[PDB]
Amino acid sequence: MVLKTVALVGNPNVGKTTIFNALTGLRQHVGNWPGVTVEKKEGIMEYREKEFLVVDLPGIYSLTAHSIDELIARNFILDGNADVIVDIVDSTCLMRNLFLTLELFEMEVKNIILVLNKFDLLAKIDIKKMRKELGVPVIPTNAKKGEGVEELKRMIALMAEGKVTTNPIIPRYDEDIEREIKHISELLRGTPLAEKYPIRWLALKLLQRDEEVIKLVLKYLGQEKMDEILKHISELEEKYKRPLDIVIASQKYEFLEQLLRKFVV
Amino acid sequence: MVLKTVALVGNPNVGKTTIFNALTGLRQHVGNWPGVTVEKKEGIMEYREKEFLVVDLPGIYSLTAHSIDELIARNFILDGNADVIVDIVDSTCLMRNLFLTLELFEMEVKNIILVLNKFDLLKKKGAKIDIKKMRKELGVPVIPTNAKKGEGVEELKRMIALMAEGKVTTNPIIPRYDEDIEREIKHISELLRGTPLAEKYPIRWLALKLLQRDEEVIKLVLKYLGQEKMDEILKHISELEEKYKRPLDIVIASQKYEFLEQLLRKFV
């Protein structure tokens, strides 16, 4: 088998480092990410005679363009350097943690696994449900003890082979948000971008005036059309008093408060 | 002092039980809420010889009509059984927790104290809460605690007793929804302004509930006010609903979080 790559992502202090060590033993390398001071830890994970290169990404709260680390993550996942994405979540603050999961899902990743770390803290969550609801595997872990870790290795090894079905849930927004989404799409899908990036994502980012995406989408559209689009975005920014990143987030949180009611036994 | 009551409300596993034990020592009584299986715990809190009756309400994430537990807190507070309301919050997961805080505020509750628990785990992971600004922002006192270690508990009793004496002033910040939603709240409020109902419940609240078709509120307007009165309300709701594709309860909550993000920026 070719050398598959596994990526560890999640918030800071969710036990990401703990699960990395838990998967790579002593076989770890230490370097830094291209052009920046951010350290980069990668290692070799073994399982059933199969070997995997595990890259641990710097902890992050979301996938915007407001920090090196969030951009280290989006660049790595988007450009396709990840065969398997292991999204690690601190089970004690599901709302905040699943918020990133959502941003990941929206980027249209499909080969992802959800680890509910620090799970060793008490209520009762119906994993079976979380799995059906989110549309991805969910493995509870007590990394600081090594529980579930083995179940993780198997599921990673299983996904790498392409024997795991997934369909990550995609949150829906206001008609107004969904309509402006639709127009950016049926105006961007008639562009080479669609071949390299997920349209839905690219639009969501534009509405939020993503520094980076707004730059790329400007390279294929005349400065003119980008103003017609920014203009419409400005009017959206009018209906909603608050700027768009906050409105999209507000709707993500509620989406989660709904999903969470379904998980909590 | 006359027997003052103190109610503890908050999400499950936040320290509510630990605070309850710290405040009541072993002077607790276990029983159950009227005509329901739900357990009801209560005990005596002492401070400079004054005695308080602390009641622990089942842990909840909001105050909808959707569950026994939420309705127990809903009713206990609204029917005036609480002289003081202590809202226990996990400092390491504010967004989730504060939603419930905004609800209590919307019930026009005023005698409330917010308790930032697990403050140790906060400054540990390297978080940063500006308590002084938060108190100014939310409009209620804010006490950092570490239930398990017992830190802040004594400062909590002080504030509690103080509020009971009526020596504390607050002005809970109230969220404001978009224009269209505020108007219908204005109407329903008006239509309820002069009633034996709006004289026992926060007009602003009763209104807000009705826009989401709150099961227990509707049955409250039929018993206190005519069936005709409830229909005059209906066209207003149906009316607003028309202005929104998603359900109202979803959009309202959505904007409630929208209110929270901007709220959290001001002190985190």
SS (H, E, C) chain B: CCCEEEEEEECCCCCHHHHHHHHHCCCEEEEECCCCCCEEEEEEEEECCEEEEEEECCCCCCCCCCCHHHHHHHHHHHCCCCCEEEEEEEHHHHHHHHHHHHHHHHCCCCCEEEEEECHHHHHHHCCCCCHHHHHHHHCCCEEECEHHHCECHHHHHHHHHHHHHCCCCCCCCCCCCCHHHHHHHHHHHHHHHCCCCCCCCCHHHHHHHHHCCCHHHHHHHHHHCCHHHHHHHHHHHHHHHHCCCCCHHHHHHHHHHHHHHHHHHCCC
Minimum distance, in Å, between the CA of residue A98 and any CA atom of chain B: 12
CATH topology of domain B1-170: Rossmann fold (3.40.50)
Best B94, B95, B121, B179 residue to mutate vs chain A (most A CBs within 10 Å): B95
Distance, CA of A86 to chain centre? 9
Cβ contacts of A250 on chain B, cutoff 8 Å? 254-255, 257-258, 260-261
CATH topology of domain B171-268: Helix Hairpins (1.10.287)
Closest CA to A141 of A157, A155, A161, A129: A155
Cβ contacts of B254 on chain A, cutoff 8 Å? 250-251, 253-254
Best A176, A177, A251 residue to mutate vs chain B (most B CBs within 10 Å): A251
Residue A87's alpha-carbon distances to A110, A126, A138, A244, B166, in angstroms, are 12, 18, 10, 26, 50
The 10 Å CB-count burial string (b at 16+, else e) for A37-60 is eeebbbbbbeeeeeebbbbbbbbb
Please state at what angle helix A223-239 crosses helix A175-185, rounded to 10 degrees.
Answer: 170
> Are B240 and B181 spatial neighbours (Cβ–Cβ below 8 Å)?
yes
Which amino acid, one-letter code, is at B234? Answer: L
Distance, CA of B97 to chain centre? 11
> Are A77 and A97 spatial neighbours (Cβ–Cβ below 8 Å)?
no
Closest CA to B96 of A173, A97, A122: A97
Closest CA to B28 of B17, B38, B36, B37: B17
> Are B67 and B93 spatial neighbours (Cβ–Cβ below 8 Å)?
no
For the domain spanning A167-265, the CATH number is: 1.10.287.1770
> Are B30 and B24 spatial neighbours (Cβ–Cβ below 8 Å)?
no
Classify the phi-psi angles of A3: left when phi > 0, otherwise alpha if psi is within -120 to 50, otherwise beta.
Answer: beta
Helix boundaries (H) for chain A = 16-24, 68-78, 94-106, 127-134, 149-160, 175-185, 193-196, 199-207, 211-220, 223-239, 244-263
Residue of B nearest to A98 (CA): B96
Q: Where in chain A is the domain with CATH 3.40.50.300?
A: 1-166
Residue B37's alpha-carbon distances to A67, B76, B221, in angstroms, are 51, 16, 27
Here the tokens at position B101 are: 């805080």
Q: Any chain B CB within 8 A of the CB of A13?
A: yes
Distance CA A210, CA A75 (A): 14
> Are A86 and A155 spatial neighbours (Cβ–Cβ below 8 Å)?
no
Distance CA A148, CA A159 (A): 16
Residue A75's alpha-carbon distances to A70, A93, A234, B35, in angstroms, are 9, 26, 28, 57
Q: Any chain B CB within 8 A of the CB of A253?
A: yes
Here the tokens at position B76 are: 């206990």
Here the tokens at position B31 are: 């029983």
Architecture of the domain whose range is A1-166:
3-Layer(aba) Sandwich (3.40)
Quickly tell me which residue has 């992802």 as its tokens.
A112
Q: Any chain B CB within 8 A of the CB of A190?
A: no
> Are A81 and A2 spatial neighbours (Cβ–Cβ below 8 Å)?
no
Q: Any chain A CB within 8 A of the CB of B178?
A: yes
Cβ under 8 Å to B: A residues 115-144: 121-123
DSSP assigned state of A142 = B
Distance, CA of A153 to chain centre? 20
Cβ contacts of A12 on chain B, cutoff 8 Å? 125
Cβ contacts of A258 on chain B, cutoff 8 Å? 250
Q: Where in chain B is the domain with CATH 3.40.50.300?
A: 1-170
CA dihedral B230, B235, B238, B244 (to 10 degrees): -130
Q: How would you classify the pairing of strands A39-47 and A28-32? A: antiparallel
Cβ contacts of B250 on chain A, cutoff 8 Å? 254, 258
Here the tokens at position B17 are: 């039980």
Tell me which method was used to determine the 3D structure: X-ray
